Amino acid sequence: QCDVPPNSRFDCAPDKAITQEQCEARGCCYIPAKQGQPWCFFPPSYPSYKLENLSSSEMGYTATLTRTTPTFFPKDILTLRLDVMMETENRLHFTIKDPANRRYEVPAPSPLYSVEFSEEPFGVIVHRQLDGRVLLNTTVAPLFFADQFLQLSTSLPSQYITGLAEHLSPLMLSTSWTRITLWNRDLAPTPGANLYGSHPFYLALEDGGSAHGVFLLNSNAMDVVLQPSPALSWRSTGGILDVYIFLGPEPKSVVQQYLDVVGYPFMPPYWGLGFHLCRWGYSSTAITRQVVENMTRAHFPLDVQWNDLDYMDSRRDFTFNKDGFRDFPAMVQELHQGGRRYMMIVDPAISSSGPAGSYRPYDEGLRRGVFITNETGQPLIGKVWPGSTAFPDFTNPTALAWWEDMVAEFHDQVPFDGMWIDMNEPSNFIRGSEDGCPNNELENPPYVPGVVGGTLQAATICASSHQFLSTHYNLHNLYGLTEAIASHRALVKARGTRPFVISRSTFAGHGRYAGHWTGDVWSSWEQLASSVPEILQFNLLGVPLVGADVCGFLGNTSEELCVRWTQLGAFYPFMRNHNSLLSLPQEPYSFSEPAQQAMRKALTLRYALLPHLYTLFHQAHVAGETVARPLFLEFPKDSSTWTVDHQLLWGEALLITPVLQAGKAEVTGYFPLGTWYDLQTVPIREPAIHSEGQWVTLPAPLDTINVHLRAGYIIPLQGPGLTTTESRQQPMALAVALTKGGEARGELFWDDGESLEVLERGAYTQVIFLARNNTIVNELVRVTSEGAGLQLQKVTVLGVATAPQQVLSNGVPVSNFTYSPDTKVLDICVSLLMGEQFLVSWC
Ligand SMILES: *[C@@H]1O[C@H](CO)[C@@H](O[C@@H]2O[C@H](CO)[C@@H](O[C@@H]3O[C@H](CO)[C@@H](O)[C@H](O)[C@@H]3O)[C@H](O)[C@H]2NC(C)=O)[C@H](O)[C@H]1NC(C)=O
Ligand SMILES: *[C@@H]1O[C@H](CO[C@@H]2O[C@@H](C)[C@@H](O)[C@@H](O)[C@@H]2O)[C@@H](O[C@@H]2O[C@H](CO)[C@@H](O)[C@H](O)[C@H]2NC(C)=O)[C@H](O)[C@H]1NC(C)=O
Ligand SMILES: *[C@@H]1O[C@H](CO)[C@@H](O[C@@H]2O[C@H](CO)[C@@H](O)[C@H](O)[C@H]2NC(C)=O)[C@H](O)[C@H]1NC(C)=O
Ligand SMILES: CCCCCCC[C@@H]1N[C@@H](CO)[C@H](O)[C@H]1O
Ligand SMILES: *[C@@H]1O[C@H](CO)[C@@H](O)[C@H](O)[C@H]1NC(C)=O
Ligand SMILES: *[C@@H]1O[C@H](CO)[C@@H](O)[C@H](O)[C@H]1NC(C)=O
Ligand SMILES: [Cl-]
Ligand SMILES: [Cl-]
Ligand SMILES: [Cl-]
């Protein structure tokens, strides 16, 4: 009975340090590890639930689950209801609930899956129908379902699993007895720690390159434990088991299927894809204006100027000081006059210490009962930047109305273009409240997940504090998401155009409302390298508008680190350089001339690619696609890609291989089977890498980042500007990467860059580009006033093996072309319109 292979032992003492006698008294097996692996584990006969009265419904199954022997946890729920819903051919959904009490809940034709059930011990078994592979099997360990402890386990199909944000780790999670804690926490990113957000989703790869995803729709503090058998255990401190399985079979299909439940990514405004520049320490409008002046003087693109806490009066939301920021409104109006936008920090917590009637956000918040309350029904008071603060309850419909009013009234004073919502874990400088927290089972639960500080109260507010929908215990992991939703709506009402919200704290489904940055990353080579997996991970989780602080936030960047970080950072979907109060300056213009040139080239290339990046965001928004994606999403059948997380793709076609280490003049990266053209051969070293699926060492001097364009793809480009206001007026270009057989395909999505309801109203242009048999044509999917008059002036064709004798545009010899026999590049001058059918030919 105790003859269980070490890697298959499930922990029977997750709650406490246990002796052999206590372990055996629990009905568990005690076998010390020979050097982590649990010493106290469940025998196969450990009491679980028994399935009874399984019955077939329309859309699936229902059953009773009965536990006859209590666990070592208090308040086992001995009778459960199982509901299985076969929702689509790709999506299976099951719940396990208490039928006697409403518990907290987060607010050939055949399916790809088959489901069967173990009776005793109870388990759900999900097979992939096509190849019989076991994807889910919850029979592997007991089902625990107590008031403050849920545990469901499964076998995994492989050692390859990704998800369960937010943590600083490789894209592929370690299955070596790893405890991953989901409890939103203000902490500078470091490995093994619960960070700002919680995404209870994983994607599991299968031998051969198929994949499936599992979402547990549970917002409680949880541990997810991975062991090398391989297997996973969800361990939640409340709510219910609400489980979705997504059958893929392609990894990109798993992600889209997940996003079909939690929401497709919001469409950002075009300007939001430009360069953002911020620090804590721009302590006046004069200094802030000098940042824009200095960037402009040195020909550095900048779409958006930001301020941190500097702008506020005594670090309070919806104020500006009358010292350095007396003329704040004029500053922002002037930014708009120059074609730039403005962003500023907003904290959730509201100063509670001001004289009554002197600070409207608090005074009005008190009147309308917007704040999280304590045992006596008064506002819970903590400490953040302004001192004593109350915390808005963004589950309260009246708090939403209050937040809309405060944002709209402040926007009437200072016409900011979005909100940078920080400290929204929610972060508390003291433990729970100024008054501490009561002694109850929510504050002191029977199972505390592996959170930093060892308590649910650490760096946040009391768990038993009251919100409109439930206790903070159940809602904590949603706090940031609820603020992001409230802020999205507030910005839609205030401005009447697409909202731009960048949030620190997140939850599953965040990407439907807002973007994210990875928080207080050190200015280190390690954090530069760690940013690639984390940006890729957020893309898999439907938050494609993500990036890290370019050059790092904490400490002092070096010039070499800031060159490499700007080079990589230019391929973050959200690109912002941000810097701490105590740091040396790190604006592009603050470095040596050669570092400035490298940084200017990185920004120039990003601005040139913006029509492509915007089209990739359109695909995320309409089809649940990733923007930044790991190689394994695009080449899943090549198992060499599975562990690659220091390279990224933009969409299907652009491979970025950054230097992530000091003192390097070369980088080794994986090239999937195919031809990869060096983007340096496109007017804005091997001209083409011919790969069989192999590692290639590339030259990568300090002034260089390796970027390759996949053969078979066409990229739309636009001319330069220091803003997207300027760049969107420039003529466009195509980069056409031919296959050996002379084929390529690409597309362009164009709209006005900021209106709401564009796709519903049809207020966009959509064009497909096709290369075939020495011709390039456009195919007009939709042509409207927005995009019709886009000028195409240049067509660069890569992989043209012989010099053409003639190049025609609509049947007429072109004004000029150049052909380079060394690089096999054909560069063609044209005068065409994206929205009018053209034919470019050569021979
Ligand atoms: C629920 O939250 C409220 C605040 O909204 C807490 O009120 C606080 O209660 C303490 C006493 O328990 C007050 O401390 C007292 O302050 C006065 C001076 O103002 C001092 O003379 C007393 O010796 C004592 O320190 C505190 O002022 C008050 N805070 C505010 C903002 O009024 C309440 O205690 C919370 N309830 C629980 C059970 O946590
Ligand atoms: C499993 O179900 C049986 C039978 O339940 C009946 O039929 C169902 C379709 C549904 O309509 C129920 O409401 C019916 O009662 C349960 O056994 C019955 O228990 C009830 C109440 O204790 C009793 O009145 C009947 O005599 C029993 N009927 C039979 C045929 O034995 C049984 O309790 C269910 N098991 C569990 C664990 O819930
Ligand atoms: C799902 O997991 C269960 C438990 O690990 C597997 O059931 C065991 O199968 C082994 C080998 O066939 C038997 O010797 C054990 O007696 C079974 N245990 C129990 C509790 O039934 C089961 O095979 C797995 N199902 C699938 C389809 O893989
Ligand atoms: C110099 C110490 C820096 C650490 C504190 C930063 C506090 C706050 N959080 C940052 C964003 O995560 C932001 O820049 C600042 O307002
Ligand atoms: C802008 O550049 C000037 C001239 O080099 C410098 O004195 C000033 O401090 C800079 N200001 C900022 C905010 O970088
Ligand atoms: C960064 O540089 C400044 C100036 O030399 C210094 O005071 C500060 O401590 C440095 N920061 C770190 C973390 O070394
Ligand atoms: Cl012992
Ligand atoms: Cl509740
Ligand atoms: Cl390999």
CATH class of the largest domain: Mainly Beta
Largest beta-sheet details: 11 strands, mixed
Structural class: alpha+beta
Straight-line N-to-C gap: 77 Å
Query: Radius of gyration in whole Å, from Cα?
Result: 28 Å
Report the strand count: 48
What would you say the CATH architecture of the largest domain is? Sandwich
What topology, given as strand order, has the largest sheet?
45-44-48-42-41-40-38-39-43-47-46
| Overall body shape | globular
- Whole-number count of domains: 5
Number of helices: 14
Task: Give the amount of beta strand, in percent.
Answer: 25-35%
**Would you give the CATH topology of the largest domain?**
Immunoglobulin-like
Bound molecule kinds, no repeats? a molecule of 3 linked components (NAG-NAG-BMA), a molecule of 3 linked components (NAG-NAG-FUC), a molecule of 2 linked components (NAG-NAG), ligand A1IPC, 2-acetamido-2-deoxy-beta-D-glucopyranose, chloride ion
